[PDB]
Design a protein around this ligand. Structure first.
Ligand SMILES: *[C@](O)(C(=O)NCc1ccccc1)[C@H](C[C@@H]1CCNC1=O)NC(=O)[C@H](CC1CC1)n1cccc(NC(=O)OC(C)(C)C)c1=O
Ligand SMILES: *[C@](O)(C(=O)NCc1ccccc1)[C@H](C[C@@H]1CCNC1=O)NC(=O)[C@H](CC1CC1)n1cccc(NC(=O)OC(C)(C)C)c1=O
Lengths: 305, 305
């Protein structure tokens, strides 16, 4: 047993990471088949960043202005196009290590692994979640742009995230792989504010179920509640409202433990109102909301890829 | 910026994971060159586990009793030997995907990434630390045995951990890759008890430095202290005594921030004595101790592999 913030194995994704340079700017790209994907702002110089006209900057460019490097090797760029906020560079070599893959758009509350990259090399791997203000709480430095987030389902890699920018308070914003930002953000260097964030209620409940599965059960009381009486307390704490769909999703965990979802809600209601008082749950002093139900199940049963 | 529990990219290690079966027992093995490593208790049946005589069990075995499977493929076992608590199975094929690697014995306080595996397939990756009682706080299920822990330096994989067992309170114990247990544990099914754990003081200080680097500075006060006055408070909280070697190790972080180590100690002294009072540091409500100074530097500067 035990319970950890767990990321997917990053192997299939490491073999797709390359370095892309255009003039003065080096960042990361994603090489699948004969196409490299990277943030379109690789074509900007630090002056252009205030309000770049990207199509203007782009026409001024030709195939050989983009240096794509795959480790030791140099790839040949035989075409380029721009889709929303990503650059598509057609190269002459298909990536032999391309995995089976899809491009997915995730929704607020869902989680994914991030492979943090610098100069086409992977630096480290960590798990995080799309928040309700469409930011993520990442760990990104200069040169991390173009790093990607992903999930795995048996052998297929689902790419959901490409990293573009840092926002006030050290949170991060990026796009899906078709180049559309999550949230109301733009790839220009102007003042941008992330909205207010809410705790992902359904994920907190899933993590409470994981604690029970693992032996930590001191927080279980003997009351029950309704959705309305729960939502009434939850929203005075900026928890996301719980819906009947959320109850349904937690069904399997409720089954595995024998604890009805609305009883677990009663335990959470009393946790919110009365605090932890120095106790921890699964080694944490806070209520962890970056485990989805499907994460808890995946880790507590042993799903491999 | 930002700061996450970050694991190493697991690619180089995924290509070394295989499934080993012997009679009734399937677990994981580590395939480097023409040798597969796995826990010697793969040769035990559930009745032998109370007090196995391993050399007796082992002589009763022959090369073909060990089924080694590398994904789709079956490997042929042309020899076997036992070193302390690991089994060495010589196979007829060298692993083409073997990375540059070493076997290292890690000390209490040091960290490493764990690639959690089931039936030779990787399930997930997470970071953890060798505790001062020689346990680790892992996430391991039935069939996880033989999963390994590792670090990376440039291109070389340092293997430090092979997983063997669960102990009371859901902590875990295993060996280095030469088959010697960390701590006073044995691979028999008898009552074994993890000892008293201490907080890794030098790592807490490193994480406080990471918070400052990332703009979380509310806990900084304006006092200083000495080693003795710090150790006096720390040991009243089961923190590990801080030594002059520990001060020295934190030098670089102290340099990068401009905050002397003994001033940061004064901030920690007041954190211990006065608690967080509902504030968080880098998103946590507890004092994190599973980031070494190297880790903080690694993540806040962008070291790639
Ligand atoms: C990303 O472009 C990147 O990695 N580029 C390669 C590179 C950048 C700098 C030096 C060498 C190589 C960065 C990633 C950022 C940088 C630090 N941590 C990150 O997540 N993204 C940007 O720099 C981004 C450009 C996007 C298109 C508009 N950018 C530009 C200007 C300002 C900010 N953010 C900012 O000012 O942060 C606050 C907190 C508001 C001060 C920005 O993300
Ligand atoms: C490991 O051997 C393994 O994965 N074996 C393959 C396998 C086991 C069971 C079913 C199918 C396939 C396990 C890993 C354990 C199991 C669950 N989580 C883990 O980390 N290691 C053991 O089972 C271990 C054998 C080691 C040589 C002595 N073992 C045996 C008997 C008891 C325990 N622990 C235990 O009883 O835990 C407490 C908390 C004390 C109840 C044990 O780890």
């Amino acid at each position: 047993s035990g319970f950890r913030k767990m990321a997917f194995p990053s192997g299939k994704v490491e073999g797709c990471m390359v370095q892309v340079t255009c003039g003065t700017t080096t960042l990361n790209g994603l090489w699948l088949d004969d196409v490299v994907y990277c943030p379109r702002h690789v074509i900007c110089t630090s002056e252009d960043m205030l309000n770049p006209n990207y199509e203007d900057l782009l026409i001024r460019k030709s195939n050989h202005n983009f240096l794509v490097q795959a480790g030791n090797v140099q790839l040949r760029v035989i075409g380029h196009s721009m889709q929303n906020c990503v650059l598509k560079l057609k190269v002459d070599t298909a990536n032999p290590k391309t995995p089976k893959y899809k491009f997915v758009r995730i929704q607020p509350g869902q989680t994914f692994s991030v492979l943090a990259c610098y100069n086409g090399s992977p630096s480290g791997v960590y798990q995080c979640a799309m928040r309700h203000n469409f930011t993520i709480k990442g760990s990104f430095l200069n040169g991390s742009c173009g790093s990607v987030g992903f999930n795995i389902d048996y052998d297929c890699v689902s790419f959901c995230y490409m990293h573009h920018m840092e926002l006030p308070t050290g949170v991060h914003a990026g796009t899906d792989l078709e180049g559309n930002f999550y949230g109301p953000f733009v790839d220009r260097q102007t003042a941008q504010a992330a909205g207010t964030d809410t705790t992902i209620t359904v994920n907190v409940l899933a993590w409470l179920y994981a604690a029970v599965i693992n032996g930590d059960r001191w927080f279980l009381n003997r009351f029950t509640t309704t959705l309305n009486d729960f939502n009434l307390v939850a929203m005075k704490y900026n928890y996301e409202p719980l819906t009947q769909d959320h109850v349904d999703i937690l069904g399997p965990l409720s089954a595995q433990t024998g604890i009805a979802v609305l009883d677990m809600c009663a335990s959470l209601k009393e946790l919110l109102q009365n605090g932890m008082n120095g106790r921890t749950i699964l080694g944490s002093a806070l209520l962890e909301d970056e485990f989805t139900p499907f994460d808890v199940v995946r880790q507590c049963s042993g799903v491999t890829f």
